[PDB]
Symmetry: D2
Subunit: 268 residues, 4 copies
């Protein structure tokens, strides 16, 4: 119960990592406003957390819907301590050469409007509340904000753009609001794409991609966020970027891990 | 003359850094095609260089215009060895708080369509020619692709996004096309902002910004691009990022430069 | 209490951040072994925590001393879940020009033997126990592992070297041992330098250094280490680097923080 | 002939990349002082470049020998414009678990004294000349200064430490001396180790390690250095870090390159 008394707003919190975050935050004693597109999934969530969650239907690309979510959060819980802009869409790892010429303009808008603009609108809408509470923003990034081959040019560009948001917003909102990034990766989750458009099997994932040698469940990706939301724990942190992807950036050339056989080599 | 027989295509090449790059490449023995919105400044550079530079009036946001620049370059010179997507737009360093709610959506599009989508379209247009010549792309980034306070959230996010393009496109176009980034910074360029949107002079704050202790002329920033365009010099480089901003990322806390008193301390 | 039943070993844990970490881990339910040069400050912490902390007097530069700490921890508690190599030495922010020629060799050894080699020996000593418990290492880095002006060349080079250890050891010890780094910064610790070697107060320059706009108490920096020590929270993290320095890397050019006037501009 | 009139000092310039640099610099019109251990190899080099090279026998770990080299350079050519600290030793990729306990202390000193201290001594010795000429330092780094699996903990830590030297020295020597890093990798070269101590075949190197799909010759690694030594080209660059390793940091998860089959896919 690290978050007793705290209030969070989470975008894209009806399913996936968003939902795992909502469930984790509630279990920690926090109260959670959720912005997402599915009314039915939001109401199911509300009743699962009776009193600790409020669900607001809306589009993350719309500043007005972002504002509605912030107002609704304010009305139910009285404050906003932590904002987690989290809602994102994928590009299917569609390479530049495979992006249809008649499709690139639409695809760009679809992915950038959700992934980057929706993050910008979330901060904008929650800004007065966050300054008031001296709160924090924790952006969901991705491995694709750091290394290639986690998406195509569009997705990879969006997640690199949110690293820019972490940096610029950590500067701009200082000294009142802290701004940090968690960059999750290698999760067991189905990533959706845009209407305009439309990748590694388990064997290659754990031998070549993930040094930790396993694909963690969604709940295991929630602790980094809880850390940034815990005022007693994360106060010195602003503009921080936590890579949270099983070790993708420290993977080896021939194998992901170098010490599979340490238990036998050290004869522990 | 390091680039004799080479062909470059530069977007945003009729003024600012782009123009200095046109001048430099022509002087290095290269033939140059230029995509720019300014017919006047394009005519001007066409008379300066003669048959060594062709200008195409167009909009960097448009794929058909980028393709038209690529075809016009092919028709004039036979090939494309180097692409320099360079054309950019600023956001008047406008903070999120100061971004008007009624303008923020259109402002997002204006700056992201030129700074990011225009880069993507440039590469898309030129891909067949670049793969044919086994050439290279060199993206103009900025200090705002790496550190805060070089623009507002919109611009900083866009330039962080082109860092994403350097990395993803270096992966995607390898082994045939090398993709690198130059990140220029201490320039006295007066870069325009969007019409959907209504900062201290660099000289006034130099000692808090630039370790090099001086404001380089525009021509001083062209050498990095020549390096990346020269096959015999930059062959091992792909996915490289050259911070080329006077040392903004290595500035001290009290003052930018740490060795002002070195000539006295060493008795020069 | 997040660390009930866990055992940590902390080098340099009798004063400064190290001591705050001992206090925090004991309060989280963990049992703690401490390697420190100060028998006095070790006795002091032994009476404060009772059977929850054992102190071993020794030299972090010495492998046999590090091994002795590991064996003493094993004998007292049965296992090692977390290693925090933390013990460090400063260089009085002495510039290269100001490093005496007759002292520079010994100064190199003093600072590199504790800051780098002492980290290597800590991990070497504890490897069998860490692999057995499938635990983790958390290296104390510093803002000087990432940006200039946080020490002279010697210290900055050492802290950049521990960044190398985070990455290489995360690769080498995966999948069994996670290796991460915390990089603390805005502390009021008075860290000692070498005897082979004879800076503005942080408070005087705060507005040029810290976006957060305040000097955190030592206890405020302990939460990141608890996060990394907690298996249920930091499981996907290996090779991660947490900048935890008040936002030194995202400071503005004129002043550290960009939003001093946010409460007035939003009318809080 | 980019370097006509310029004077360079290069450590470890008798063989390997050092020698390729010496040969390149002389071909560009520069004059070169070389510090290395082999008298016979230095004299052979001197006569190959009659008048454009001076060879000084000495140990890079010794400030006195570094001073001798600087004095000798001053005496033959009258100035020093560019310093390239380049001399380095490898660790054989010896993992922490494979470093013998009776060998680690010696091995640490051997690799750190050459790789880090020898770089520090080179700058120290050449400092008055470089301030006088307003010159530049270009440190040879490595992929091992950025990613794991290019060496063991020792080598990787040393090359990460030189990134720290780039940053701190770029700050400290500003505004008079520029300081940058080239980080070469994937070269066809035999890397020597220390007396205390004592890795990828071609097939795995070009499929998994090098996006560029080829191992470049040594001469192809010389252009980045020529760039930093060319005053007309690199003036805005201080604290820059050029990754120069075939694209190791932008390599893909399953294959190094993503676009091997672009010529056929685009049907160029």
């Amino acid at each position: 119960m690290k978050l007793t008394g705290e209030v969070a707003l989470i975008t894209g919190g009806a399913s996936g990592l968003g939902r795992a975050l909502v469930d984790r935050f509630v279990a920690e004693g926090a109260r959670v406003a959720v912005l997402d597109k599915s009314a039915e999934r939001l109401r199911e969530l509300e009743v699962a957390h009776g009193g600790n969650a409020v669900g607001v239907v809306g589009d993350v690309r719309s500043l007005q819907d972002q504002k509605r979510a912030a107002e609704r959060c304010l009305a139910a819980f009285g404050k906003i301590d932590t904002l987690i802009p989290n809602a994102g869409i994928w590009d299917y790892s569609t390479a530049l050469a495979d992006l249809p010429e008649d499709k690139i303009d639409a695809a760009f808008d679809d992915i950038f409007h959700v992934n980057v603009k929706g993050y910008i609108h979330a901060v904008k809408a929650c800004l007065p509340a966050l300054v008031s509470s001296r709160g924090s923003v924790v952006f969901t990034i991705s491995n694709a904000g750091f290394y290639p081959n986690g998406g195509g040019p569009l997705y990879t560009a969006t997640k690199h753009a949110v690293v820019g948001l972490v940096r610029q917003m950590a500067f701009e909102l200082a000294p009142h609001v802290r701004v940090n990034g968690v960059a999750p990766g290698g999760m067991n989750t189905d990533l959706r794409g845009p209407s305009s458009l439309g990748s590694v099997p388990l064997a290659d994932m754990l031998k070549s991609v993930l040094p930790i040698g396993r694909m963690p469940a969604l709940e295991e990706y929630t602790g980094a966020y809880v850390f940034f939301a815990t005022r007693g724990d994360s106060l010195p942190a602003t503009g921080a970027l936590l890579n949270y992807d099983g070790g993708m950036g420290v993977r080896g050339f021939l194998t992901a891990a170098g010490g599979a056989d340490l238990p036998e080599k050290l004869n522990i």
